[PDB]
Every structure is written in C-alpha cells, then in structure tokens.
C-alpha cells in the first residue's frame, strides 16, 4: 500500500485499512446528508392563531344570521391570520456516531486514491502572500479546481488562496467530508498525510 509522490520520486507507505479499503455508499451518503443538515440556520417562524393581532370577539352569533358560523377573525380558514401549524426556530442537526464518521472519511479518501484525485507531495507552500503567485504555480502543476491540505496552517498560502474561487487551503486538523469531495483534485503534503493517518488510524 504505497502512494507515489508527484516529483520527489519517494513513494510513501500508508495504512491499507485507511487508504485502500472498499467504498461504503450507504455510510458515506449518511455522513454527507448530516453535514449539510448540520449547517442550517434553523431560523424561521410564523404566527399561530394565538399570535395574530386582533381581538377574540365573535364576528357574528351562533344562530339566526344567514351566514356561516364564526368564532374568531383569526381562524386559519379566514383571510388574514391563517397559518394552522406555524413554524418555530428548530435544530436540524443530526447525531453521527464517532465511528460512523471516521469510517466514512476513510471510505471517501480510499476512493480518491483509486480515482487518481488525491495528489501527494513532499512540500507545498508559497513565498509571498500574492494570489497571483499561487495562480502561476497551480497552472504549472496543471491544477485548477482543487483543495489544498497542508501540514501546518500556512498563512501566506492561506492568504494567497482566499480570492481564488476554485482553490481552498486547510490544515490537516480542520478537514471535513464535503470539501474532500467538492473539488476535482485534492493536494496533501507529506506531513499532511502523517497527520490524517494518525487521526483515522
């Protein structure tokens, strides 16, 4: 179980249980749905018939008038003050088992290898914090739509990437499931691998 380094020509030995295991479609699906649910601002409401403004005088009697019986001008059948089952702010987040999350990360990462979307290098950094500098480098590597994961939260690299829409930078500690999927290619430093490896183990 060896992932070939792009240019240094120094293959890197990784755990086959992490990077070499089978794709679990049902499991990965469940973790991606919960992350998106976990990102909601569950922020909404409507007014119940109790919260519509107005008074609770009977608009007109239980009997004798030719009209349909009424009780409240805020009845939800009535124009104005409807909303039979009004919304509250709510929490859309879901639980994920520690193990189901880690299991899921490993399956996706193992597929990345198999589809040649994972790219390993000895080093990945930039000189001055100029997005243009990075842009030149990325063209040279023949990369465009890409996620960058580095060994430490490198700042120059971090600053240079912010205005590049097809590029994101991440330290190993801050990774998440949907980013690893949402880009065409994914770049990891040698150091980045060792940190991701220990984390999933």
């Amino acid at each position: 179980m060896e992932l070939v380094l792009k240019d240094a020509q120094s293959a890197l030995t990784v755990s086959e249980t992490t990077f070499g295991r089978d794709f679990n479609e049902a499991l990965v699906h469940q973790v991606v749905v919960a992350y998106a649910a976990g990102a909601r601002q569950g922020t909404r409401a409507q007014k119940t018939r109790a919260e519509v403004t107005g008074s609770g005088k009977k608009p007109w009697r239980q009997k004798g008038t030719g009209r349909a019986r009424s009780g409240s001008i805020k009845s939800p059948i009535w124009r104005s003050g409807g909303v039979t089952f009004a919304a509250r702010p709510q929490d859309h987040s879901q639980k994920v088992n520690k193990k189901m999350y880690r299991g899921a990360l490993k399956s996706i990462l193992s597929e990345l290898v198999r589809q040649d979307r994972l790219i390993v290098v000895e080093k990945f950094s930039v000189e001055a914090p100029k997005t243009k500098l990075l842009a030149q480098k990325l063209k040279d590597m023949a990369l465009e739509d890409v996620l960058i994961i580095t060994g430490e939260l490198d700042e120059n690299l971090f600053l240079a990437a912010r205005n590049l829409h097809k590029v994101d930078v991440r330290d190993a500690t801050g990774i998440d499931p949907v980013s690893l999927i949402a880009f065409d290619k994914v770049v990891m430093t040698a150091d980045a691998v060792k940190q991701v490896e220990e984390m999933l183990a």
Binding site: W60, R61, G64, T65
Partner: peptide, 26 residues
C-alpha cells in the same frame, strides 16, 4: 379629477330578529 371613489362603502349589517312567527306549535 375622476377619483371615482365616493363610497366607503362600509356596507351596513342588519340584526337581528323582526319576525319570530309560528307555528307547529306544540
């Protein structure tokens, strides 16, 4: 303009009973 809107209208409601006339009557 020719505003065309004199009426409120605010249409009036009569109530309640003028006539209660029978009969069945029991």
């Amino acid at each position: 303009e020719q505003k065309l809107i004199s009426e409120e209208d605010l249409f009036s409601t009569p109530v309640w009973i003028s006539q209660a006339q029978g009969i069945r009557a029991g």
